[model samples]
Target: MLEFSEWYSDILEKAEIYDVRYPIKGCGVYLPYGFKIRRYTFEIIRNLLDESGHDEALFPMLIPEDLLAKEAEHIKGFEDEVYWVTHGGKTQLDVKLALRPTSETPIYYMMKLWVKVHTDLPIKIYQIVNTFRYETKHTRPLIRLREIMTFKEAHTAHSTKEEAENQVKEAISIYKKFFDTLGIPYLISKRPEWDKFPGAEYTMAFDTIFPDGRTMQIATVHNLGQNFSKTFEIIFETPTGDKDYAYQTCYGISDRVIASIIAIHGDEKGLILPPIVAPIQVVIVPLIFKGKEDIVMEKAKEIYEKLKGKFRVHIDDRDIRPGRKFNDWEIKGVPLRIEVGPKDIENKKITLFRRDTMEKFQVDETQLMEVVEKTLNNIMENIKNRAWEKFENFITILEDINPDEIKNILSEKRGVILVPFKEEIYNEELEEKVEATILGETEYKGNKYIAIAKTY
Candidate 1:
């Protein structure tokens, strides 16, 4: 419900995401509360990748100038945004360093040394780290930041291009699941040569539509096709006894996951945090505080401790009215607000207000945690359904879509514009002029839809 351009910046501050008024133009500080939410958001990503055979890595943040320039195209691609450190201290250093725009160059150097044998063919490594970019454009919270809050860089080394290519598919599947968990709809697109990452053979990017109808890149998986391997000298001996260059690829999703959640699920009320990432999943406020404040607060704290292991719950007993506390938690998007008034306590019950639907109800205390967890699950599903409903209408045919008309509809506050494309003549120059790109063709299941747009 919240428009992104002007309103989100203010709501983000109210929710304690980041302070945009920092003196530094693009670099803003994440307050403690916001940082805590971010940590949980990324931890879910880490757990997802970790379960999918991804090994953890903590690599250096700075790349030597020569190493960064290893792949000619990559250097050209990132040259504009890369920050160079010329002097170590006072004296100008002969060997300069570049603050990483991303972690591939530095991580690949280590991969090259660790993976020289056929047994090490599938080197799966990922790191969560900060990446720098010199941004000239205006910055937006969770959308565009010069100092990338988090970068999930996963680099894979393979003995053959075929294996690496398969990894690219697997990577996308993982990314799809990642988005599915976050309750955001995404379109996968094969970037044109001009838009593809430098030194990559092809780039498959995942993007979601904002309420304003524009698209934002959520994740990207690139096929390097031995491009990085050759540059990093990641040579591995083959099973046939020939020394061959390993095929390397880098795939990543960044802190932008948080951004997409804010953009897609949020409203004018404030951030509608997905239960997966909300730092406080449930906030307990004592409603019947007439003369039973002590007893109710004590009971609330006891339940909080009981469910603390399985969920993130908090008791807000600050010197504020219950109505004020409800407004505060609603703004913060805590999935559940439990009000244990004196009457409910006496009756062994609590009033539950669900964030996703904003419906209120009374629940028996005996089943409080179970019901709350179940409601949280429902909230997550509802968010996913909301995303699907919004996106299902935007997926038009590539060749048949009318960009101008779609843009007009969006100006009237409609959903996304899924302009169609002619596969044969998918020109990059024309793509920018039209303010649209081919985001893959629509493939509906069970004939739920038909003739949505034109095609090549």
Candidate 2:
């Protein structure tokens, strides 16, 4: 595999994902090819939430300055990264508007007006929008950005704190299903006290190991537990005829979700996307020669038309050489490639190329769709198993806390290490001395361990 830092930036433009040369620092232009992947990814989460009775919404991008500061702790968490608008096209604004660092404060402010009775207690709404945060550190395309191009943030309010806590669990399940469907395995952990979301009672995070031996957080579910509701005065009448603050939870996944898919599944060949998210699931490259060009194109179109209804199939019958077409589609990460040639047509067979394993074989023409579907199902399981095995291999066990040993592991083999944590040692300040932070604790069978790693 190519060095991840070098390969990552190069593959963005090479695969036509995002153009990092968008003029603004920490901002990227998502080209058509990249946006299609996002569209497919978003569709999965949208369907999950739509089925769960969550309504979709579109909130204004700009938050009034006064509303933003209403929740002091939430404002403090985002104050440094916020972008303020003092004027609208040279006209001085009455109140300086702040670009949403996140929609919690603004969403809660609106909820204050909408939620006035117990009937409106469980309000779950989500929006897919661009959220801005000024980044001073070196920014990568999707991993770290000033403008997160595609953010799916869901906010929910419940009548009781217990119900809100359960909402957090449901959000976690939704995220688990979303990532698992894309074949990206993750480590779920509760964020440490100092690292939890702003104004949140607690935060549960989902992170995946990148190929470069670093952890990247892909999703987070935070239980606000009336923090924002109380700050914003989101009061509702209770069943017992008493006024009470609403319990709230917010969870989100951004384009960083796309980053994990790319980092974990990619290799030196380029992106190796899961079949579910691949834009072109199957690409057909016709091998044509001087006189047999027309015949070969006819066979390619026939196969394309046959599978067009059930799958995303493409037939590249361009005048380009077969080798070029093969290389191009491979880099684009098409899950399968069907090759048709004059010789193969004579034999009543076609060659199938598996992108994940780079394996090729021949299948009978009569069983084309059946074989393709079987291979597609197998391809999904195959890549997921391969990626999961790699992630599992990076996990190392640490029995004791030795600072030198810790530095050695981080400096060289930079992956997650399961270290034993004592009740006294597992405080919020543990990250100050060690390079890594506690990613929360988990019980495996009977023993308990914490996932520790230096993150991206």
Candidate 3:
């Protein structure tokens, strides 16, 4: 906890999650194991979105300069970070092409053609694709990157302002489920006026505290309120045959979801991944005795064959010491480990190890399936509880305080501080004074409050 940055860097490589040796400055390669984890995590969100009436679609990676320039405020917000393609091979292009920082402009431009009347007013679509940004800050593998490899952006257009507002609430509900399923605890707050997404009427964000007491933004939901629609000419006929600009909302999640899973649930040994997203939910390590190797190997194979159909199970029959195999799987963050030995086979028992608690116990072989299912659920609940406990411990509530007190509290405690609502306090000077950013307003115990924290 004292050196979270170093520990995070070391764990990424040690757990074989990501490789930072890629040629690009702010891009890293997701290794096979990491890719599997990413895939599973994406699948969960995809399913949630699909069930919630969102259709998946893909858009071109490059946005024309003219199209991106349509929304002046949006383009201005991302102008510095955008990467433009001025030439096609050896020829200079007539118009510049920009690698999308976000798909707002291009997606809205296409929506102009798709919507014509009230029936077509509600357009719910999303895409999972790569986005490019020329980040100037220090880049970490998954937390901060120039080429965000797994960006899941959803865009929706509604007939009226009320529908768009409802969509924002629905989007938050979906995000809450997504984070909960991964055993990640989060704080939802409306962003301050000065910090909200550009071109958005207002923005709601999800932030989670890291082990080091710094908060990282993992998701954002924005209410566009005809900003992009009017710019892109996305006009639709109302139910009464009146023409008006569509109301829109957009929400996104990125590789930071994977980063949260690794950072929040990991330990000194390695990752303690939730069972839902773990590539290998169960691994069997055979304790092969010198003379009784055949019996142990046979028992291990029998168990693997039995459980293979139910879980993502693997049998570690490597030619190495038992202790080494145990350590390797522990580092890989398999949720459950089953040890088969001569004694276990003789007694018709299976020894199980839980990565979350590092607890070892034995269950009857006949109860393997039931026990495995129940134990996996318990591990996820335990991880969720432990993470929230640590997060809550760092939060401080102060009804009144000065800049000095704010600075001292942040410097010593190093977590979020909730203060009574005050618009004047949300300025850059106070942030500079206390060395923390205002995370925006939220209701705590039936009273309005704003959170201040040192951010990532």
The top-ranked prediction according to lDDT is 3
> How far out, in Å, is residue 405 in model 1?
5.5
Better of 1 and 2 by lDDT: 2
Error of 2 at 452 (Å): 1.2
For candidate 1, write residues 1-456 as lDDT tens digits.
445677767777887787777787777778876787788877877887889888887988878878887745644757788788999899898988988988788777777788868998787888888898888787777657788878889887788889988989888988888888888898776766666787789888877777665667788888988777787888888998889888878888876777677768877788788898888998888655569768887888877887798999988868877787898888888888888677778887778888878889998888977898898999999988888788776654333445565445445544444443445545554444344454443334422111211110
Alpha-carbon lDDT, every model: 0.75, 0.86, 0.88
TM-scores, each model vs. reference: 0.92, 0.96, 0.96
List runs of model 2 lying over 4 Å from the truth: 73-75, 444-447
Tens digits of per-residue lDDT for model 2 on 54-73?
98899999998888877565
Better model by TM-score, 1 or 2?
2
C-alpha displacement of 320 in model 3, angstroms? 1.5
